[PDB]
Amino acid sequence: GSVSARRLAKELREIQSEGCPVGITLVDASDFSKWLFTIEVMGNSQYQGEAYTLQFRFDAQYPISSPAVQFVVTDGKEAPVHPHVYSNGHICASILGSEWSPVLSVIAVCVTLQSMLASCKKKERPADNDRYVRTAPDNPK
Amino acid sequence: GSVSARRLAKELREIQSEGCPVGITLVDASDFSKWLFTIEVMGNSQYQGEAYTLQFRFDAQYPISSPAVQFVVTDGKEAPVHPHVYSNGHICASILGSEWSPVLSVIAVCVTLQSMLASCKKKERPADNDRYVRTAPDNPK
């Protein structure tokens, strides 16, 4: 297999071996192009008791390229209302952009986004939400 | 004078007689095209002891057209760090956008933006800040 696929296989092996951190659940890893997790924020937060679906898409340059990561908003699912999360599910987070590194992992991204949700003291959408979502491309990258 | 200027003269007249609400200071109304205020939040808030320069620009259609309103960032001044305030001083606030009414006033806007800064718990920039500022014109409208 390819270098990229093998890296993803190893991450999947580790998720199976180590399990996921609390509140994070692997729902589907049926290929090495798209995976789905559920994310629940634990402790005291604005999202208590809710589970959101988070999608990772991988291109052939992973892990050098960052994964394309978004909350799923299909089939009645809604994105968390958060200042760094657009209503279409796209996410503004440094880990997905300038601060991506191959030293990170899918699970590290999940934990980081869980913590970003946990840090919110007041649920509101991004300022440019409507502007962004009107012209937003399929892939948030 | 024009209808707009007379409306602004009336607002200036009221400001003169009854005064600006606490935290709000008029510093310049030398014509009926551009005014300057300072706004300061009273009490416990993330912005204590800080007074920000707020600039209003009016066109020939005020009060039908909304004023163009931005925090001033020239001459060493900096916009407050806030999720609805861009680093270039531009403001995302519905009172400046869709929910502007000719039935509102310049002081109403000052009060609204003052409240906006008082309601905030974490000084952070908008998610789209750097994307916005490189593309942003002189006029926020």
UniProtKB/TrEMBL annotation, chains A, B:
Pfam family, one: UQ_con
Annotated ranges, domain UBC core: 3-141
SUPFAM superfamilies the UniProt entry points to: UBC-like
SMART domains in UniProt: UBCc
CDD domains: UBCc_UBE2W (cd23808)
Keywords tagged on the record: Ubl conjugation pathway
Keyword Nucleotide-binding: no
InterPro entries in the record: Ub_conjugating_enzyme, UBC, UBQ-conjugating_enzyme/RWD
Keyword Lipid metabolism: no
PANTHER family: UBIQUITIN-CONJUGATING ENZYME E2 (PTHR24067)
Protein's UniProt name: Ubiquitin conjugating enzyme
Originating organism: Cyclocybe aegerita (Black poplar mushroom)
